[PDB]
Design a protein around this ligand. Structure first.
Ligand SMILES: *[C@@H]1O[C@H](CO)[C@@H](O[C@@H]2O[C@H](CO)[C@@H](O[C@@H]3O[C@H](CO[C@H]4O[C@H](CO)[C@@H](O)[C@H](O)[C@@H]4O)[C@@H](O)[C@H](O[C@H]4O[C@H](CO[C@@H]5O[C@H](CO)[C@@H](O)[C@H](O)[C@@H]5O)[C@@H](O)[C@H](O)[C@@H]4O)[C@@H]3O)[C@H](O)[C@H]2NC(C)=O)[C@H](O)[C@H]1NC(C)=O
Ligand SMILES: *[C@@H]1O[C@H](CO)[C@@H](O)[C@H](O)[C@H]1NC(C)=O
Ligand SMILES: *[C@@H]1O[C@H](CO)[C@@H](O)[C@H](O)[C@H]1NC(C)=O
Ligand SMILES: [Zn+2]
Length: 598
């Protein structure tokens, strides 16, 4: 009978969770070894342990059928059982699983090992994305130099892994169907536990798209004055290599040439960080300070002992793309970041430490609940702190911003600077998954895979490649997450919900009142707020133990993902910018790109 079975089921779960945590620990150690030191041998060890854990998960899935778990009284027990039924890639036959891991390894190591020749010296051929190419893309205003680095990088990071990417799409699809999802798109979407989630994001995106179009138009206008009309057209998509980022995902690196009020201050603290002797260690210690200032958990000694916070100097290959790692024991949590002393890197440190904090908050949960309420929640945590850190208010307190007068014009400069990171990114992030979903769902023929990518980038972001591409190129894997098989919708979700978290934290901290001109949302610093700290604790400590609306409700009483808060933040910018574009007769919108030939 079922009452007795449910009692035994609870004990089965308790043991199985602990066993999965320990087995995952071992797989994580091997993955860490590889990612911090790419070698054929580390690859082999990583993929071998994953294969073994996959075989165990298959037995676990099979063993859950011995329990009438859908008949149980406990919502909690049923939730855990449901989580253990979901195998993902581990559902594949052993041989196909191994081929998928090999394919994944080939793509991620191709990405991490890209090097290109110096534009001014074709004997010097050891320039990596991080830091060398990224420095040129973010700093050079030589449009031909920029186009050179763009083409070299995309050809090597993108086109070179076409045939591997194709096999990955096939195996990803096969795995999804073995879990009885239509495709990998529905397998990813299942993490949001909401069958209207795509519609909800379309609705929110459509409400913010007008503001994006205004920013796009203004930036295009300013780039024309800088580079001239031979480089940038009034009416066409923006050539993406001029936007300060290899993927045009964020444009804050060209703020100095597009800022609303060039005579008025624009916050860029990198030079002061350098002047005051900041190191990667100091930046992490300051992030730790921020969390503990809010009455959240301090980093444990394992973090300091085992993290990698600067690029190795020993010539090894590694993945430099910044990441946070849970080892699934107690207090073994780590970051791997090739840290540089810049403003944007200070924000990255806070981003990654948000993942760390989450891990620490939920580490007492059962293994299956030791993850984010949804993938977007995980990405949002550290960004809520980065929003504070970026404020003039905070940057003056820590001595990084000197002689700053916050008049109306400085405020618009700062709002615009923020928008170049937070609004511009939204169409970018949506396209990353729209593209992959379309491949996974079998909606695009293989003959059209490259132009289907640039078509989306055109339609949603109004950008295009600097040179003509064709179906001979394959550009999508030039972005880390695409080569590395990391779902990207989490970042779209994060960029919306982080404003709901920020706004609520700010109110709880006494730092935001809509009816008080002294407390605008865009100068809120939650540093030192135990009240904000508490809201985080209430939410993060839940892990994935409840559906994400219940996690949001624990934070601020709401249950709905909403674009209201991000619009509220940028509202003064929207008003100003709409007026400025009219005043300057700025063209809005773009013709269809001709930069991808079929
Ligand atoms: C994805 O969807 C798939 C379907 O599209 C699904 O695959 C199905 O899983 C079914 C559930 O496990 C499975 O059902 C069993 O089928 C056996 C007979 O099938 C053979 O003949 C078919 C031709 O008709 C072939 O096509 C198949 O390939 C098979 O070779 C049955 O013998 C079997 O039965 C036993 O199991 C039930 C268990 O009953 C449940 O459990 C308790 C036990 O206490 C019951 O009391 C309770 O009420 C409940 O019924 C017993 O009732 C029975 O007495 C036997 O012990 C069972 O029906 C089915 O074969 C399979 N079909 C396919 C592949 O098409 C995947 O499982 C889905 N995957 C995921 C990840 O969810
Ligand atoms: C990297 O891994 C290899 C194993 O393939 C090992 O022998 C080598 O010493 C490692 N290097 C570092 C820097 O740890
Ligand atoms: C900090 O959190 C603890 C619980 O961990 C709580 O009891 C205490 O009130 C909080 N301290 C502050 C500074 O509010
Ligand atoms: Zn992250």
């Amino acid at each position: 009978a079922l009452v007795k079975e449910e009692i035994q089921a609870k004990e089965y779960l308790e043991n199985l969770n602990k066993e999965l945590a320990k087995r995952t620990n071992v797989e994580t150690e091997a993955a860490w070894a590889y990612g911090s030191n790419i070698t054929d041998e580390n690859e082999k060890k990583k993929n071998e342990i994953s294969a073994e854990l996959a075989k165990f998960m298959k037995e676990v899935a099979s063993d859950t059928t011995k329990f009438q778990w859908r008949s149980y009284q406990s919502e909690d027990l049923k939730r855990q059982f449901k989580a253990l039924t979901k195998l993902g890639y581990a559902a594949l036959p052993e041989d196909d699983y191994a081929e998928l891991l090999d394919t994944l390894s080939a793509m991620e190591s191709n990405f991490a090992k890209v090097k290109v020749c110096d534009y001014k010296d074709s004997t010097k051929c050891d320039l990596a994305l991080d830091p060398e190419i990224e420095e040129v893309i973010s700093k050079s205003r030589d449009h031909e130099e920029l186009a050179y680095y763009w083409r070299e990088f995309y050809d090597k990071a993108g086109t070179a892994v076409r045939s591997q990417f194709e096999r990955y799409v096939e195996l990803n699809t096969k795995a999804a169907k073995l879990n009885n999802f239509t495709s990998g798109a529905e397998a990813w979407l299942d993490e949001y536990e909401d069958d209207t989630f795509e519609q909800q994001l379309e609705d929110i995106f459509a409400d913010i798209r007008p503001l994006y179009q205004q920013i796009h138009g203004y930036v295009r206008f300013r780039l024309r004055k800088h580079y001239g009309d031979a480089v940038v057209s009034e009416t066409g998509p923006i050539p993406m290599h001029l936007l300060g980022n290899m993927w045009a995902q964020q444009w804050s690196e060209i703020a100095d040439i597009v800022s609303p009020f060039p005579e008025k201050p624009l916050v860029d603290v990198s030079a002061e960080m350098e002047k005051q002797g900041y190191t990667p260690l100091k930046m992490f210690q300051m992030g730790d300070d921020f969390f503990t200032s809010m009455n959240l958990t301090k980093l444990p000694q394992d973090f300091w002992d085992k993290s990698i916070i600067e690029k190795p100097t020993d010539g090894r290959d590694l993945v430099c793309h910044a990441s946070a790692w849970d080892f699934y024991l107690i207090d073994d949590v780590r970051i791997k970041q090739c840290t540089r002393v810049t403003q944007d890197q200070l924000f990255t440190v806070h981003h990654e430490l948000g993942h760390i904090q989450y891990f620490l908050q939920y580490q007492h949960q059962p293994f299956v609940y030791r993850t984010g309420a949804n993938p977007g929640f995980h990405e949002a945590v550290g960004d809520v702190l980065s929003l504070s850190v970026s404020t003039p208010k905070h940057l003056e307190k820590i001595g990084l911003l000197k002689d700053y007068v916050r008049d109306d014009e400085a405020r618009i400069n700062q709002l615009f600077l923020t928008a170049l990171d937070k609004i511009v990114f939204l169409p970018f992030a949506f396209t990353m998954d729209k593209y992959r979903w379309s491949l996974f769902r079998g909606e695009v023929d293989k003959a059209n895979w490259n132009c289907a990518f640039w078509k989306l980038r055109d339609e949603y972001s109004g950008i295009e490649p600097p040179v003509v591409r064709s179906e001979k190129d394959f550009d999508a894997p030039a972005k880390y997450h695409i080569s590395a098989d990391v779902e990207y919708l989490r970042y779209l979700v994060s960029f919306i919900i982080q404003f709901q978290f920020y706004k609520s934290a700010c109110i709880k901290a006494g730092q935001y009142d809509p009816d008080n001109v002294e407390l605008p949302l865009d100068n809120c610093d939650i540093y030192g707020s135990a009240a904000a700290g508490a809201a985080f604790h209430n939410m993060l400590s839940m892990g994935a133990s409840k559906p994400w609306p219940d996690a949001l409700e624990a934070f601020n009483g709401e249950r709905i993902m909403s674009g209201k808060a991000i619009a509220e933040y940028f509202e003064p910018l929207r008003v100003w910018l709409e007026a400025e574009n009219i005043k300057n007769n700025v063209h809005i919108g773009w013709t269809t790109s001709n930069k991808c030939v079929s």
